[PDB]
Design a protein around this ligand. Structure first.
Ligand SMILES: [Mg+2]
Lengths: 62, 434, 513, 319, 226, 36
RNA sequence: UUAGGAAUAGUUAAUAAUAAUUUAUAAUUUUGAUUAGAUUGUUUUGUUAAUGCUAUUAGAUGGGUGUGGAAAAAUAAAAAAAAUAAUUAAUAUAU
């Protein structure tokens, strides 16, 4: 328990949690220009098990 | 040191011969550059090369831990190789954190020794002229950072004093100019055991004319005058250490008057037969030799027509041969060692016991030992890196003290060997004869 | 106030430089404030201090603040090995409670120093003293016909491969584990005495059962653990009805000797019958007179098998038992990722045409592009200095040679190749004689810390030594583009690490929904 | 934890295994080996019918004892059996030792045997401790024995809770070979103090002191006090005042002391240059040897008061 | 103060107690009022060793490529239910599966019925939020027969570990109001055969012999030996 | 103490120094120390 | 308190005025002000025949956080800090 509480920067070892603040805490100052755009055409494709079940449905319907 | 860029690692990407720092990369990234043979010098600030100097010396001891005697000799060889690559430029006043004349702030070890207002106004210029004597700006375009740190400590010894505690009573200070090895806390205790020995054995032995060999900073010479020895004379092969020691004897009051300092290799001249200087015979000859890690290990014999030993054993046999020509009858020699010759080199036999048992020129009159109480550097050559003694080596080291007299002077010291609680050899009991 | 003695002179105000706390935080790996771009493949050395390295700092050591996607570095931690005792519940007393769980790390070190005061025999410690019976009960399991020992070695290979990369098509695992040992015995048939290295699971002799439900414990009573290891340990299925292995994440690095057809010793050698080329002028004495180099054992002569231990399914924690030299061969994916990340950051942040100077640190106004080019050039110089280029089969990659000591922790990522060699001692080469000839004739003092090698178709198994303990962990997640674009280290200075390693990577919309 | 295996069952071998079965509350595993498998089965049954808190195994060969137990403790009868079991066997404990094993020998052996055992165990990688036991069999049953352990220091510190199960006084002599010498020095002092007490009471009867009960109370407060003087004096009073009375048979005999004292002259360096660099030791040895061949070997150590002058007989005639 | 331990007694600071008054010791912190609390570390942390080998899915991720097999979805729902139940039963997890949201039934903690402790809560109203495992519960507290006059908020109603026995006679529909259960002294007459008091004021439970043996072995009075 | 005018005590409130304990330092475990 | 002595001001009072849109011949200072320099004070120190000369080391601290009764809060060998941890003694610290 004391080894867990030692790794923070408390001055009096009083079982508090004081986190370290680095110089860059935001993504825009880390070189990332803007928010990442997800590929909406790639994530809306049908998965492989769904294609296999569609093939099984087309086999069993006829 | 002026670099030759054609023999460096990468003369195309770095045509200046070194890799500048800029204070951005990690310490282990610089440590990987130094281990491959690339020179490292700071680009902007002295803090970048000061942080690279402390961390590389700490990372090297983690890779090569001092586990036995053979691991300290390898670590001292590795640290001497790596710390020579950590350079600083010759014109250190063009760097940023050398001095700030408006904020009175500066980086470096000069803030441990000097004042903020005193350094940033007047002492940055006096240190600029202090380096020019030993390392001129023409011959040197770069300085090793260990030499830059030693120049800042030697400039402190030039500006103010250097107290020898607890050897000197708090007001007698010495000024070693440069290249003269001062004493640390570990280097003091072989002289602290000797000062207590000289306080009690002066008068029962009637010691008046003391001779000190290899004085260095003169700490062994000034310790004898405190115990009451009237005539002391020191011999030092360094000429600049002789001029500084005799100037400190004038500065240290009127109780250091009969102190003399001459330049000699080990002993005085003893060349003129017509002037007869042989009438000045000393009754106590003191020797406090230095024990470096490179000098304690490579002790071996060399020479065909003049076969001589090297290292610490060769320095002892120089002291054990020519001491009879300068000693009076009923006179003793005092040897101050620190037991590192037996710790760092345990396979070789004892060099002091090799003189007594085999050569049979000296008789062991007395022997004392005392364990080491403090920590610090041991026998530090000035322009090299600092290496403090580890804990497992510090607990087994002992400050020794060897008192020997002549084989011809057995009959005078015969009643000393007859007392209870003494160790007479088998040769001095045959000469007593009740 | 404080009582101060009055002086008629001026007062000295010292601003003396202390040991920098940022320096010991960067050395101990507990900084958590360094934003460092230009991810490289050079290994990082971390000296483990007292209570300064945990999972919180080791997670930032794996994934730095610059937005990394994969822990593509070998991490050497000096003195980071931990030893755990088995824990048990107390039936007696005032109630029921479990005690015994404790770590022997950072306080009981390996290789205690032997300093004493009295060709030449010195006293040293070459093996780890805590895990020495645990290595002994593994080495005695292979002690002895020869075919039973060969199928014992083939049956104990970790995952059927044992780290070796060999092409096997249309073959099951139990036949592949025999074919690898058959290939090693066919390769090592020509030499009189050679060796090879394998990964090996813990045998049945090293694990004993305890009645209380079912508790398996190690034979030596000590467990080699890493308290700063992040993630979950690797779960190995027992085959013999598939259940979990009780200590499957703890493996061994076995050195096996082949037959075909604590006292080091030092000697000082002499010779019978331009020095400093980096210095411009000539000196009366050399500034560095002697060199110190690491002595390694002899590799036998070399188609030829790969002989590289690659763990493609787990993260490796090497705990060495002897002084080893590990030659890491870098995979193509790590250097390709570092190259594309550095070039992406260079074309994003430095859009200036840079003026094309002579070298990078030339005279001129130090703009942002010049600072970035200088940092990239220093990173390339670090990569060129600490590595070498070898040949393959056609192939060429960076090889980093790492001196690993007993008590260290060598984190190896997945996909990294490495060859293992044993360090035999320490030599001293004077710089005067080495300027005229090779350093083999310039040897002055040689300490041999390993006096090992004795001298008493296919090949026969002679003996088995445990050179290192391999702690296998589950593969750490590789971040995507959107995960690395939104990864901020300041969100992980307190918590979120067990969620980072349990779930796949981090959340893309972490803490800004 | 660590597995414990005790080898050898005799008059002093069985209470060590009984105390190891008693004190180890299912924490350390117990294995039992002996010179015969029937004796090991008998002592395992004796441990099983009186209450066993831990599991115990029976073995007939040393190979399973080496491959199963990390700590091996031997308590054998003679030096030849220990030399056969430790070194001379094909399935030896030291010649087939595992790295990290701890082999303790409680047999009273020579110094060269302990030196060879420690050297071959250090070559195999194991740790050999020699700790000869001194005490009574009932004192071993009650848990009081004297052990002089020679070997490694950290191996001695690992073996302290195991040694404290059947012995109260366990001391570390230092390097191996010095633990087996302490018993030789102790029994040599026992023989010398016994001869000194016998001659002191002979001189007390010569001087005409009738009250010996107050004489021993004086001598115990003097500088010439010893435990053997307190031990033998009421028997020596009856043996001196009644010289025709035969001495009674005791547990410790003359041959039991001479079997240990016959190790010492083989363990000592060359004495023939001066022919006697140990006067009172051989002066007690000649009295013990004169008491042995006269028919009083199995009886008490106080029987040397009738052969005080016979120890002079090999001094006047051999010179 | 209003209620001190042993009156004013200050030979030690432990003689006052671990809290000086049942009221909050400062006016600005009303959360420091003395009340019965619940070990939320063991209770709110459910066993994550039932979700291994089970692919859970996020709420926002409704894209087609991230969808799973419906058998895998069903075993994920079973594993999530087993994860929510693995520590204990909530009030909102017991009242959802009851008629009329369990209004009128008696809920109780595990330690509320052992020893000489007797206390339950007759449920009156529950406001479920969108996360149906949480919310706000109300009820009449019954402690040793005596009952509150008004419904009080059930403290720690979100922490698991609750139990109830469903009785159809106690069920109150949403049209009517849940009546307060009667005080056994005041409202209904006192009958010893129906309800008998386990504890009363100035009463303390007798010493169990195993606790006496354990304390006398810990203090050293009885010869404890291995 | 009470069993089953001097004032008798309760044997549970006043325990009777249980006999399985051992005596470490007695009044006879002293020695004389002369100093001047 | 100043070896070479002159001006000072978020200013003084009144006020149905918290939070001053007003009134006044306003306030300090040659009986020494403000500013600048030196600056913790203090029958505790030293000396002497001395109501003389000469010394001082209790302390406090309008922007770090409106928290807390009170900012005194970035570091102090005890001031033992909510179950008798220990209360025989000496080192009580190095360790
Ligand atoms: Mg007005």
């Amino acid at each position: 328990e004391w080894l867990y509480y030692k790794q923070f920067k408390t001055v009096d070892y009083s079982y508090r949690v004081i986190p370290e603040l680095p110089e860059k805490y935001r993504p825009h100052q880390s070189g990332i220009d803007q928010a990442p755009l997800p590929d909406y055409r790639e994530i809306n494709k049908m998965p492989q098990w769904a294609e296999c079940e569609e093939r099984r449905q087309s086999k069993k319907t006829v | 040191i002026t670099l030759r860029p054609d023999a460096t690692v990468d003369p195309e990407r770095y045509p200046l011969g070194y890799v500048p720092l800029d204070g951005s990369e990690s310490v282990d990234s610089v440590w990987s550059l130094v281990k491959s043979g690339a020179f490292v010098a700071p680009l902007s600030k002295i803090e970048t090369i000061h942080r690279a100097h402390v961390g590389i010396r700490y990372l090297t001891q983690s890779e090569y831990p001092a586990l036995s005697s053979i691991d300290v000799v390898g670590l001292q060889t590795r640290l001497k190789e790596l710390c020579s690559r950590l350079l600083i430029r010759r014109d250190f006043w063009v760097l940023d954190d050398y001095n700030d004349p408006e904020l009175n702030s500066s980086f470096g070890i000069q803030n441990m020794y000097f004042d903020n207002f005193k350094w940033s106004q007047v002492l940055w210029r006096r240190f600029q002229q202090y380096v020019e004597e030993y390392f001129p700006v023409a011959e040197h375009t770069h300085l090793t950072y260990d030499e830059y740190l030693q120049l800042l400590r030697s400039f402190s010894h030039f500006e103010q004093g250097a107290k020898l505690l607890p050897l000197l009573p708090k007001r007698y200070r010495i000024h070693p100019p440069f290249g003269v090895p001062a004493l640390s806390r570990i280097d003091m205790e072989p002289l602290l055991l000797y000062s207590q020995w000289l306080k009690n054995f002066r008068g029962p032995l009637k010691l008046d004319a003391a001779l000190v060999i290899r004085s260095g900073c003169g700490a062994a010479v000034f310790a004898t005058k405190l115990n009451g020895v009237p005539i002391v004379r020191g011999v030092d092969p360094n000429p600049r250490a002789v001029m500084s020691c005799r100037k400190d004897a004038q500065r240290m009051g009127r109780r250091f008057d009969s102190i003399s300092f001459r330049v000699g290799e080990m002993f005085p001249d003893k060349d003129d037969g017509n002037g007869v200087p042989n009438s000045r015979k000393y009754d106590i000859i003191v020797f406090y030799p230095d024990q470096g890690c490179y000098n304690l290990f490579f002790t071996n014999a060399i020479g065909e027509y003049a076969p001589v030993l090297t290292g610490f054993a060769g320095t002892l046999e120089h002291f054990f041969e020519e001491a009879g020509d300068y000693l009076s009858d009923s006179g003793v020699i005092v040897l101050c060692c620190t037991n590192v010759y037996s710790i760092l080199k345990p396979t070789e036999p004892h060099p002091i016991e090799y003189e007594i048992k085999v050569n049979r020129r000296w008789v062991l009159l007395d022997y004392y030992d005392m364990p080491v109480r403090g920590k610090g550097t041991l026998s530090h050559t000035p322009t090299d890196h600092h290496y403090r003694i580890p804990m497992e080596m510090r607990k087994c080291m002992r400050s020794e003290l060897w008192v020997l007299h002549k084989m011809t002077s057995i009959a005078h010291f015969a009643h000393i060997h007859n007392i209870p609680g003494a160790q007479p050899p088998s040769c001095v009991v045959s000469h007593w004869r009740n | 106030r404080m009582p101060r003695k009055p002086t008629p002179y001026v007062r000295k105000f010292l601003e003396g430089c202390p040991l920098p706390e940022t320096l010991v935080d960067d050395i101990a790996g507990a900084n958590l404030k360094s934003m460092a771009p230009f991810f490289t493949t050079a290994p990082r050395y971390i000296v483990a201090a007292e209570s300064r390295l945990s999972k919180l700092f080791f997670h930032h050591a794996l994934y730095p603040a610059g937005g990394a996607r994969r822990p593509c570095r070998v991490l050497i931690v000096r003195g980071g090995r931990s030893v755990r005792e088995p824990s048990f519940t107390i039936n007696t007393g005032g109630g029921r409670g479990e005690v015994g769980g404790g770590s022997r790390g950072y306080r009981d070190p390996a290789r205690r120093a032997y300093f004493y005061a009295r060709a030449g025999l010195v006293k040293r410690a070459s093996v780890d003293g805590l895990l020495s019976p645990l290595c002994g009960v593994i080495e005695a399991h292979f002690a002895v016909g020869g075919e039973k020992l060969c199928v014992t070695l083939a049956g104990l290979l970790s995952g059927g491969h044992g780290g070796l990369m060999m092409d096997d098509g249309n073959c099951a695992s139990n036949v592949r584990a025999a074919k690898r040992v058959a290939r090693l015995l066919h390769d090592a048939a020509h030499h009189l005495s050679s060796f090879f290295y394998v990964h090996t699971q813990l045998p049945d002799s090293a694990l004993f059962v305890s009645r209380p439900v079912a508790v398996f414990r190690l034979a030596g009573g000590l467990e080699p653990t890493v308290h700063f290891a992040v993630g979950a340990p690797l779960s190995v299925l027992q085959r013999g009805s598939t259940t979990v292995l009780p200590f499957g994440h703890i493996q061994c690095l076995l050195r096996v000797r082949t037959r075909g057809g604590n006292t080091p010793w030092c000697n000082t050698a002499g010779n019978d019958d331009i020095v400093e080329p980096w210095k411009l002028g000539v000196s009366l004495d050399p500034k560095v007179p002697f060199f110190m180099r690491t002595l390694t054992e002899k590799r036998p002569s070399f188609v030829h098998m790969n002989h590289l231990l690659v763990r493609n399914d787990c993260e490796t924690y090497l705990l060495p038992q002897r002084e080893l030299l590990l030659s890491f061969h870098v995979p193509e994916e790590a250097e390709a990722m570092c190259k594309e990340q550095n070039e992406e950051r260079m074309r994003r942040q430095a859009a200036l045409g840079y003026g094309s100077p002579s070298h990078v640190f030339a005279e001129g106004p130090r703009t942002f592009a010049r600072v970035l080019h200088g940092m990239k050039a220093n990173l390339a110089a670090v990569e060129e200095a600490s590595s070498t280029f070898r040949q393959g089969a056609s192939g060429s990659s960076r090889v980093y040679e790492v001196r690993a000591l007993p008590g260290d922790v060598v984190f190896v990522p997945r996909g990294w190749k490495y060859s293992v060699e044993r360090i035999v001692g320490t030599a001293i080469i004077d710089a005067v004689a080495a300027s005229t000839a090779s350093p083999r004739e310039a040897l002055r003092a040689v300490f041999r810390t390993a006096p090992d090698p004795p001298l008493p178709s296919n090949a026969e198994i002679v003996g088995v030594e445990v050179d290192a303990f391999v702690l296998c962990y589950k593969p750490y997640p590789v971040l995507s583009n959107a995960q690395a674009s939104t990864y901020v280290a300041a969100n992980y200075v307190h918590s979120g690490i067990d969620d980072f390693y349990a779930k796949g990577g981090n959340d893309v919309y972490h803490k800004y929904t | 934890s660590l597995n414990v295996g005790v080898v050898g069952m005799g008059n002093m071998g069985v209470p060590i295994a009984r105390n190891l079965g008693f004190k180890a509350r299912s924490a350390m595993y117990l294995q039992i080996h002996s010179r015969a498998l029937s004796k090991a089965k008998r002592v395992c049954d004796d441990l099983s019918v009186d209450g066993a808190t831990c599991a115990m195994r029976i073995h007939d060969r040393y190979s399973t004892m080496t491959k199963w137990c990390d700590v091996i403790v031997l308590a054998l009868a003679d030096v030849k059996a220990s030399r056969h079991a430790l070194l001379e066997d094909n399935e030896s404990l030291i010649m087939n030792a595992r790295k990290g094993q701890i082999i303790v020998d409680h047999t009273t052996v020579d110094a060269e045997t302990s030196r060879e055992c420690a050297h071959e165990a250090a070559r195999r990688g194991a740790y050999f401790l020699d700790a000869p036991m001194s005490g009574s069999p009932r004192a071993c049953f009650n848990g009081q024995l004297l052990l002089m352990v020679g070997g490694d220091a950290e191996t001695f510190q690992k073996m302290l809770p195991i040694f404290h199960m059947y012995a109260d006084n366990v001391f570390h002599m230092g390097e191996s070979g010095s633990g087996t010498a302490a018993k030789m020095i102790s029994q040599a002092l026992v023989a010398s103090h016994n001869a000194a007490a016998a001659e002191a009471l002979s001189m007390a009867h010569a001087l005409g002191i009738e009250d010996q009960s107050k004489l021993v109370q004086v001598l115990d407060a003097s500088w010439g006090s010893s435990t053997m003087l307190r031990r033998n004096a009421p028997l020596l009073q009856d043996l001196i005042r009644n010289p025709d009375k035969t001495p009674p048979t005791s547990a410790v005999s003359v041959d039991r002391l001479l079997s240990d004292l016959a190790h010492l002259d083989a363990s000592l360096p060359k004495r023939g240059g001066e022919d006697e660099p140990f006067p009172v030791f051989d002066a007690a040895l000649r009295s013990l040897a004169a008491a042995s061949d006269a028919g009083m070997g199995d009886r008490d150590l106080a029987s040397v008061v009738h052969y005080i002058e016979a120890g002079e007989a090999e001094l006047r005639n051999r010179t | 103060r209003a209620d001190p331990l042993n009156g004013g007694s200050s030979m030690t600071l432990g003689s006052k107690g671990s809290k000086l008054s049942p009221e909050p010791h400062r006016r600005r912190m009303p959360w420091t009022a003395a009340k019965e609390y619940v070990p939320g570390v063991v209770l709110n942390a459910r066993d994550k060793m039932v979700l291994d080998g089970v692919q859970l899915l996020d709420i926002e991720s409704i894209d087609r490529a991230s969808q799973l097999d419906p058998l895998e979805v069903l075993r994920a729902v079973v594993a999530t239910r087993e994860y929510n139940i693995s520590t204990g039963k909530n009030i909102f997890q017991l009242a959802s599966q009851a008629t009329y949201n369990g209004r009128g039934q008696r809920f109780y903690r595990k330690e509320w019925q052992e020893g000489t402790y007797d206390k339950y809560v007759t449920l009156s109203a529950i406001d479920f939020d969108r996360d149906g495992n949480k919310g706000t519960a109300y009820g009449y507290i019954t402690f040793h027969g005596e009952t509150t006059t008004r419904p009080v908020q059930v403290d720690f109603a979100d922490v698991p570990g609750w139990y109830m026995d469903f009785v159809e006679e106690r069920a109150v529909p949403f049209t009517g109001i849940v009546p307060p259960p009667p005080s056994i002294g005041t409202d209904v007459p006192v009958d010893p055969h129906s309800y008998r008091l386990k504890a009363y004021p100035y009463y303390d439970a007798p010493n169990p012999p195993e606790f006496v043996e354990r304390l006398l072995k810990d203090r050293g009075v009885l010869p404890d030996t291995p | 103490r009470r069993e089953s005018d001097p004032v008798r005590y309760d044997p549970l409130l006043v325990p009777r120094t249980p006999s399985h304990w051992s005596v470490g330092v007695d009044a006879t475990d002293v020695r004389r120390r002369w100093q001047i």
